Design a protein around this ligand. Structure first.
Ligand SMILES: *CC(=O)N1CCN(c2ccc(OC)cc2)CC1
Ligand SMILES: *CC(=O)N1CCN(c2ccc(OC)cc2)CC1
Lengths: 304, 304
């Protein structure tokens, strides 16, 4: 029993983190096979960052300008290319610790682990979600860019995020490992504001199922609802519309607990309308939305 | 910016996790040098667990009864001994991945990372605190016993916890790596209830400092207090007494923010008395007490 915000074990990703320096800028790169992946803004002077022309800035860079260090050993750069907002530095050595890996682009509401790094060295691991506004709520100081987000499926690391940007409101923007930003964000120091940070309804429901499984049941009530009725309340509270696809996804948790998805919706509806009244669920005073239904089943069943 | 509940990178500990089987019981062991450490209750039939005599049960066990598997490779057990509530299985092979390590016994209020494992395989990593009642609030299913808690100081893993027990109230009990239980807990299936789960005041203050550093300032007020006045309020709310030692520990955060420790105490006093009024601090609706002052300075500065 117990239910914790849990990251994937980080060892397979620790084995891939290197330091990338270009001029006076040091950040992180991801070393897979003979390619190091890093944010293209490694080539920018903070001056450049106001209105960078990356193709033009990159012309002034040679392979020997990209200093790539794995622990205390230098890697030899034998090629560099820009793909969208990442650079791919071809090195003469395959990372011997390269795990089985995929590059995946996740959807809003999907969770992942971040290995926060500075100068190619791991500092910590935490669990994030892609927010409906395509930001993430991270922990990233200067030097942390090129830190990556990932899921693990047994022995295969799916990389989904590389850190690039902090918005003036302290939330985070980044790319997939093809260098495409999540959401409308750009690697430029400009007026970019996040849209509404809506609550991931299907995740909240998953976490209420986790709560029931783990003995927290006070919020169960005598009510049910319909998707349409629930969605009127969701709308009012800046929750994502619940779809039949979400109901279908919650089926296994419904089955295990014997609580119909729409009954748990009516519980969530009452919590939205009435609040917690100073009570907690799984040690939280708010409705947690960074556990997916897959996360809850994984943690409640003990997958490795 | 941003502030997350952050675990240490788990790779160095992943490298130490093995499977231990005795009869029909499988749990986790920690392999350091040529010793595998595991809970002594691996020798118990669930029947034995009501009133086990461990010395007597251990007489029926030989080296060849302890099946120790590192990934898919068996380790040869050449000795076994009981130390307090752990077994030390001497194996014929030093773990080649043994990191620099220490065994430390932590105090209540100290935080650590747990690598939750099943059958010697890592499932996830999360951040815990030793509670003032000597429980931890973990995520541990059957098979997770022998999972360990740790801090890292650069390249040295300090192991502080091994998981043994769940109490009927769903909280966790375990030992240090010398096999001494934290608190009054025993490895027997008996009436053991946790005492008051008091809030770790110095940690809450550290986290309020983290909040100010990261832009969350609404709870700052025009008041101050004294340790004695604050402690009257702490007492009433089941918070730990704040000591001058705690004030001294918060000095660096005081200095960095320019907020006197006793002014932050007066902020915390108002939050205790008035509540959050539906507001959040660093995305929490309650006062977070599982960040130490050391954790806040580490995360806010970017140590690796
Ligand atoms: C996210 C990251 O690691 N980077 C972007 C910002 N960055 C930076 C460092 C130092 C200054 O001035 C002192 C400005 C920006 C480093 C790379
Ligand atoms: C914590 C842990 O891993 N263990 C203690 C409890 N345990 C156990 C397994 C199966 C049953 O009956 C089905 C009872 C207890 C396994 C080891």
């Amino acid at each position: 029993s117990g239910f914790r915000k849990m990251a994937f074990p980080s060892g397979k990703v620790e084995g891939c983190m290197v330091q990338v320096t270009c001029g006076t800028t040091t950040l992180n790169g991801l070393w897979l096979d003979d390619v190091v992946y890093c944010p293209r803004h490694v080539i920018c002077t903070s001056e450049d960052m106001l209105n960078p022309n990356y193709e033009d800035l990159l012309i002034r860079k040679s392979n020997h300008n990209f200093l790539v260090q794995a622990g205390n050993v230098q890697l030899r750069v034998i090629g560099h290319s820009m793909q969208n907002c990442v650079l791919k530095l071809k090195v003469d050595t395959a990372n011997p610790k390269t795990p089985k890996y995929k590059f995946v682009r996740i959807q809003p509401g999907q969770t992942f682990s971040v290995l926060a790094c500075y100068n190619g060295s791991p500092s910590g691991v935490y669990q994030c979600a892609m927010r409906p506004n395509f930001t993430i709520k991270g922990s990233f100081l200067n030097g942390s860019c090129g830190s990556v987000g990932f899921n693990i499926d047994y022995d295969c690391v799916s990389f989904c995020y590389m850190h690039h940007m902090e918005l003036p409101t302290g939330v985070h923007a980044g790319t997939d490992l093809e260098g495409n930003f999540y959401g409308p964000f750009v690697d430029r120091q400009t007026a970019q504001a996040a849209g509404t940070d809506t609550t991931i309804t299907v995740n909240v429901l998953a976490w209420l199922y986790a709560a029931v499984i783990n003995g927290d049941r006070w919020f169960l009530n005598r009510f049910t609802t319909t998707l349409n009725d629930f969605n009127l309340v969701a709308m009012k509270y800046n929750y994502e519309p619940l779809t039949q696809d979400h109901v279908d996804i919650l089926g296994p948790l419904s089955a295990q607990t014997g609580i119909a998805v729409l009954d748990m919706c009516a519980s969530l509806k009452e919590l939205l309308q009435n609040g917690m009244n100073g009570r907690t669920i799984l040690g939280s005073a708010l409705l947690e939305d960074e556990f997916t239904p897959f996360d809850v089943v994984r943690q409640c069943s003990g997958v490795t």
